[PDB]
Design a protein around this ligand. Structure first.
Ligand code: NA
Length: 129
């Protein structure tokens, strides 16, 4: 599924990301924009042979199992394909564990490079929240 901006803002708020670990909703929408272009089905292979999956580009080296990332962890205890669902529940629950892990949202390279320090509130402007 390719979400609209305000549609995703609403879903991310429904699922508890607004101000989660102190990151306002616009941080999460901006991250999703630049990680996945709001597309739940996005996948991208990484140099170490892991893959990033879903609207928040969650990595198989640490967070999910994809059957092809040796020696990797599965900290969210889920197959990586579950993170490609139209239903973002699994991606959000996993994201909450990622952002709690120590480096906050710096875990998302697109967030660090394109969102952090910017006017993230813009990403929710106009939305009915
Ligand atoms: Na894994």
């Amino acid at each position: 599924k390719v979400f609209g901006r305000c549609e995703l803002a609403a879903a991310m708020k429904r699922h508890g990301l607004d101000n989660y670990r102190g990151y306002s909703l616009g941080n999460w929408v901006c991250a999703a924009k630049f990680e996945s272009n709001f597309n739940t089905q996005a996948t991208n292979r990484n140099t170490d042979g892991s893959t990033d999956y879903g609207i928040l580009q969650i990595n198989s080296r640490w967070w999910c199992n994809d059957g092809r990332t040796p020696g990797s962890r599965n900290l969210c205890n889920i197959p990586c394909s579950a993170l490609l669902s139209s239903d973002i529940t699994a991606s959000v629950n996993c994201a909450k564990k990622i952002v709690s892990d120590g480096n906050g949202m710096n875990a998302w390279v697109a967030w660090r490079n394109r969102c952090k320090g910017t006017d993230v509130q813009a990403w929710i402007r106009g939305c009915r929240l």
